[PDB]
Amino acid sequence: EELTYRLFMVATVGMLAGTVFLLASSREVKPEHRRGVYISALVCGIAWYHYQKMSYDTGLRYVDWVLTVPLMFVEVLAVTRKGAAYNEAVRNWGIAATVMIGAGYYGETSAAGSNEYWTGFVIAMATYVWLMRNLQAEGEGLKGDQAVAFENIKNLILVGWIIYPLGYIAPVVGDFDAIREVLYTIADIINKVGLGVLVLQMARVQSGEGNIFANKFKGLFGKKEMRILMVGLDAAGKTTILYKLKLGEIVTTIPTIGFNVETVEYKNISFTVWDVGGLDKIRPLWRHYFQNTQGLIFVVDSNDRERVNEAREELMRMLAEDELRDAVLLVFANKQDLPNAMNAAEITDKLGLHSLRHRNWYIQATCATSGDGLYEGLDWLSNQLRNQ
Numbered sequence: 003e004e005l006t007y008r009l010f011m012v013a014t015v016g017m018l019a020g021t022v023f024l025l026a027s028s029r030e031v032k033p034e035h036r037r038g039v040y041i042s043a044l045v046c047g048i049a050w051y052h053y054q055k056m057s058y059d060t061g062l063r064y065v066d067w068v069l070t071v072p073l074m075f076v077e078v079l080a081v082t083r084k085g086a087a088y089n090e091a092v093r094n095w096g097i098a099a100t101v102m103i104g105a106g107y108y109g110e111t112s113a114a115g116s117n118e119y120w121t122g123f124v125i126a127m128a129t130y131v132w133l134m135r136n137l138q139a140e141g142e143g144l145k146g147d148q149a150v151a152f153e154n155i156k157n158l159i160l161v162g163w164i165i166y167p168l169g170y171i172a173p174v175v176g177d178f179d180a181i182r183e184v185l186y187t188i189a190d191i192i193n194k195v196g197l198g199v200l201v202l203q204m205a206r207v208q209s210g211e212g213n214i215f216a217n218k219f220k221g222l223f224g225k226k227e228m229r230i231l232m233v234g235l236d237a238a239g240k241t242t243i244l245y246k247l248k249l250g251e252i253v254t255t256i257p258t259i260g261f262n263v264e265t266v267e268y269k270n271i272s273f274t275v276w277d278v279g280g281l282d283k284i285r286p287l288w289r290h291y292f293q294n295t296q297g298l299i300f301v302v303d304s305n306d307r308e309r310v311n312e313a314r315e316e317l318m319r320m321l322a323e324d325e326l327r328d329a330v331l332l333v334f335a336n337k338q339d340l341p342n343a344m345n346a347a348e349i350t351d352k353l354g355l356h357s358l359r360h361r362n363w364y365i366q367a368t369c370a371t372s373g374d375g376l377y378e379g380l381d382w383l384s385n386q387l388r389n390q
């Protein structure tokens with residue numbers, strides 16, 4: 003009695019602290035890797051609100067499970083599934099979890115050892131095994147650090163959720179009516195807080211420059227046609243950016259002597275790269291690549307203070323082209339890691355971006371060698387071209 007009540011007090015302070023740790027740790031992870039951490043904090047918030055209320059009514063616990071369990075499948079399936087396979091998995095797992103929790107409440111509210119007690123146990127165990135068998139099959143396409151991090155998510159549920167049927171069986175294998183609530187509370191505190199930490203641990207590892215398996219920049223553009231021109235002075239870092247995106251092989255062509263072109267194609271997205279400036283006889287040939295250009299990326303070496311003025315003249319002359327009147331401008335203030343590098347505010351000032359009228363533009367300080375800022379700039383450019 004007095005011991006079964008002390009755990010209800012610790013879990014209440016535990017679920018709130020879990021929400022406190024997850025929300026406070028969501029700052030040290032990239033914003034694109036926060037959707038799972040926020041849902042994990044929502045799970046601990048729903049648990050804290052119910053564990054404050056919880057002669058002892060068990061319906062408050064099953065109301066907590068019927069809401070949090072499918073939400074924990076949401077933060078798990080989002081790691082492996084994306085589109086149509088995601089909504090079909092969340093729907094099936096959410097239905098299976100509803101039948102599991104529903105069958106348990108049907109049997110637990112009945113008399114222990116009755117036929118309704120075991121009927122609810124059988125159906126719940128069947129859906130329980132179904133959910134666990136599908137969880138084992140998930141993550142087959144994951145590689146590297148995400149495969150390891152998702153394996154910890156799999157093992158925590160596969161092992162941690164065993165406590166629940168054991169707590170359900172306890173009242174009939176002995177005089178263990180309070181052990182059922184103890185095992186439920188320990189399992190709720192361990193699984194819900196633990197999964198949030200593992201989702202946070204996954205977000206910490208996902209938010210990084212590591213792109214061995216070339217997945218970081220994949221889910222930004224979608225399926226629409228998107229022709230992107232990425233230009234800038236020589237040595238600005240353009241070829242380095244193309245390698246960092248890891249969206250495909252760089253196709254290098256020399257249509258005429260003195261004119262070098264690089265292209266990368268992925269789905270219906272494309273980047274075309276050449277140097278601006280140089281000989282005046284090469285300039286007219288750029289016109290053969292301007293039509294139907296949606297995004298214009300200008301890469302500038304922020305450490306080259308001697309040629310920052312020549313970079314502006316090339317940008318403005320490019321923006322004067324009538325075929326690029328609707329092109330969305332994205333300025334990459336590259337090489338921010340160098341000691342003499344000008345910040346994004348000074349690059350905007352020296353490039354005169356505030357004088358541009360009727361032009362949807364954005365400047366992003368980047369380090370192409372490490373990849374910092376590349377995702378933020380492309381995410382903005384993708385948002386402009388998809389939502390227009």
Ligand SMILES: Nc1nc2c(ncn2[C@@H]2O[C@H](COP(=O)(O)OP(=O)(O)O)[C@@H](O)[C@H]2O)c(=O)[nH]1
Nearest residue numbers: 236237238239240241242336337339369370371
């Ligand atoms: N420190 C630093 N160096 C960079 C960065 N981006 C490119 N570079 C260097 O710039 C040199 C040439 O860049 P490159 O990609 O060929 O520029 P491109 O001629 O416009 O294609 C390379 O040796 C890179 O090491 C960066 O963000 N930081």
Ligand SMILES: *C\C=C(C)/C=C/C=C(C)/C=C/C1=C(C)CCCC1(C)C
Nearest residue numbers: 067103106126130163166167170190
């Ligand atoms: C707080 C959220 C969690 C992970 C709750 C999980 C509960 C279950 C896995 C319990 C299922 C049951 C089974 C497998 C058999 C008897 C009836 C139960 C509902 C206790």
